Amino acid sequence: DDKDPMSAIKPDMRIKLRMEGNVNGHHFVIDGDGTGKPYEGKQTMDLEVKEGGPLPFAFDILTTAFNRVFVKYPDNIQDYFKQSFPKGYSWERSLTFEDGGICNARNDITMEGDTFYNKVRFYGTNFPANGPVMQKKTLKWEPSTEKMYVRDGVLTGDIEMALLLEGNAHYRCDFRTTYKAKEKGVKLPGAHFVDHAIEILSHDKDYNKVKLYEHAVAHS
């Protein structure tokens, strides 16, 4: 009642990130520098491939691994992610594509001052050589709705995602993400939804440099 509601999560935050991983044996390191408005559910990040470029696969498969703090939560829904700070939280994600491609991603999110730090790992395998990921035929992720609910005691988000491809086709992917506050006493939320829209605003021809944007809103 007397607490500063923004004692940890300021209205304007900075974001620092390093992702390591490999997809179908192709290794990479990617750095991110960004800003966001946690209470508006908006964030922008400048990404730069530091090792392994030019990436021989669709950059789009990586972009949701580049923080559910950046969601506009109404007052009537418990905000597990803003409640996880200053200490932070982590998530683990499975990406199961319709052609057998499979990715596992994880992010450890800490906060130092005004900056979220992200330790990201991304591993993908079993992508067909002739498929749209290795051939770089993707255009964007479609806007999505994540179902947030408690599954066996752990906050879980399920999404039916789709990449738009060249040639009026889509390429489907199932997401399951588990979210774990570092403080083990954070209160779990009731079931709800988060609408997402992620997009690449600009990029170099070989995607060595990418500007990424996401807008997210929670609702019932």
Side-chain angles (χ1 to χ4, degrees), residues 83-86 88-121:
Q83 286 286 99
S84 294
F85 286 88
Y89 74 104
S90 63
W91 55 254
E92 178 89 18
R93 182 172 310 154
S94 64
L95 296 80
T96 306
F97 293 89
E98 65 171 82
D99 61 356
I102 168 72
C103 297
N104 293 101
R106 65 188 56 94
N107 189 3
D108 187 278
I109 305 166
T110 52
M111 185 200 79
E112 314 285 355
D114 79 330
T115 299
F116 295 107
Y117 283 91
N118 300 258
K119 182 200 275 192
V120 177
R121 300 297 184 258

Side-chain angles (χ1 to χ4, degrees), residues 68 71 73 144-146 148 192-196 216-219:
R68 210 68 55 255
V71 177
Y73 264 85
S144 71
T145 295
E146 179 175 21
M148 292 290 201
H192 60 281
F193 300 91
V194 178
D195 285 355
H196 299 269
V217 179
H219 63 89

